[PDB]
Design a protein around this ligand. Sequence first.
Ligand code: HEM
Ligand SMILES: CC(=O)N1CCN(c2ccc(OC[C@@H]3CO[C@@](Cn4ccnc4)(c4ccc(Cl)cc4Cl)O3)cc2)CC1
Ligand SMILES: CC(=O)N1CCN(c2ccc(OC[C@@H]3CO[C@@](Cn4ccnc4)(c4ccc(Cl)cc4Cl)O3)cc2)CC1
Length: 455
Amino acid sequence: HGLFKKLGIPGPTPLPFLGNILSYHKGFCMFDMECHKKYGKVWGFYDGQQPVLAITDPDMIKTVLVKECYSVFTNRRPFGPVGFMKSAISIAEDEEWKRLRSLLSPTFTSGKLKEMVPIIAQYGDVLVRNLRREAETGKPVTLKDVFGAYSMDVITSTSFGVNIDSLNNPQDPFVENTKKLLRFDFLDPFFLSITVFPFLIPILEVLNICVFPREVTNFLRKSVKRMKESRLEDVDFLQLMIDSQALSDLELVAQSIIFIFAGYETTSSVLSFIMYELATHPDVQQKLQEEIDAVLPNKAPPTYDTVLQMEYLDMVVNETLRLFPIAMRLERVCKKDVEINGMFIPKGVVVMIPSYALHRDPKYWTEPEKFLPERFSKKNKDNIDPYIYTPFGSGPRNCIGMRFALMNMKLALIRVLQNFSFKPCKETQIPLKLSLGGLLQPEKPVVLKVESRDG
Ligand code: HEM
Ligand SMILES: CC(=O)N1CCN(c2ccc(OC[C@@H]3CO[C@@](Cn4ccnc4)(c4ccc(Cl)cc4Cl)O3)cc2)CC1
Ligand SMILES: CC(=O)N1CCN(c2ccc(OC[C@@H]3CO[C@@](Cn4ccnc4)(c4ccc(Cl)cc4Cl)O3)cc2)CC1
């Protein structure tokens, strides 16, 4: 625990064995907000015994995320016991990650994204139908239930060329199982013990103990094999992975499960945050509709080219991701002793970039608390540092599905907003309050009321 002292870097005093984890009672976002304000440009703390160095300087951020990615800052914090999911790209290391990256990245080229628009359009139709049902009754909507089903429908069909039709089944197996893959929350004596005694991880790995429920991984393990069967019995993410067979049968499933979960969880999450922000700013919700109407007059179906035309939509999406970067923190492990922009960083340290905190630094963002889409306007855009604003990370190891998620959320949003308007109702949580999880999640689902437009 003497490390940060010895290095001259400040921070909260750790407890023996525990480190600074009891500070996690208010969530990672408040912890990082506090430290940033108290300690300044750079601070340090201990997740159990693991030193974590938070950095704030934009050029220093470019160094660990971009310049020295391959050389020293390549991998993320080790995570286990993880079992067969060690193959997964998001937790793969060094050259294994490198070749997994160059394999799967063509999945999301412009051109392949264009192909996905007519495929998503079908589910866009089922989306507007389900919400219309809720606009007729006047009943409240748990948005995570409808945008989730939509996210799940979109990512299965674009990646595996299979229509699991989640949007009509409220009790679809692909959504029940996939949502029960994270969940871990604060103070679970499992994850808590693993942060404090990470030397236990090997034993758990040896006893075949796993973070993910085997029930849930069995179903996902099965489902993907069935989907792989269909393609081999008559070019997307699936196809791209079959062709490499250098993927093992189990490595393929690992990658799939990443994309399935990322598809479902990430997309619907952000969508709920966007929807909330619009419903609580109808001034902004209307200005967006005006734009959607102008670029696509009388309910004209959206296209890849027309999405790129909607400047205000992109502003609104950007501004939500500023307040709600679901990853909260970027991180990368230091492979070897190094000096960067003047600062010594020892081997083994976790270097952490506090996205959430920096998106609210009064130094770069005037009135950081407020939802103001005008921040990202063409005339204002050039004062934003691209290393301060990092909803999708930066460099060779950024979010592989960035552009897909942006297009797909914009697609849903267009289909929704050209048809409906969203008003806050009874059950709606104002102000919004966030869970104490590993990804950014609201405590109690976002509930809004749905009105139809004109007549
Ligand atoms: C708007 C929704 C999304 C947000 C805000 C988001 C954000 C992020 C962030 C911040 C990271 C870490 C990047 C870094 O460490 O620099 C990441 C990684 C990753 N994301 Fe996303 N993401 C989203 C959607 C998606 C989607 C739709 C997919 C797949 C279809 C996906 C797949 C991945 C993968 C595979 C990684 C690990 C990359 C690697 O280590 O090679 N994400 N994402
Ligand atoms: C399959 C896959 O791609 N991935 C597996 C899941 N990965 C992931 C996601 C979130 C995440 O944050 C987990 C949370 C973050 O904080 C702790 C400790 N911790 C682990 C890593 N960094 C900090 C924690 C400490 C003590 C207590 Cl009581 C509860 C928790 Cl919670 O786990 C850690 C890892 C993301 C990548
Ligand atoms: C709280 C904290 O310290 N941290 C929060 C989590 N941070 C983190 C670390 C790694 C990471 O890798 C992206 C991986 C890639 O896919 C997912 C979902 N996802 C999130 C953003 N983009 C995709 C994912 C897939 C499957 C499962 Cl089971 C769980 C998760 Cl998530 O995260 C995404 C986020 C690590 C640090």
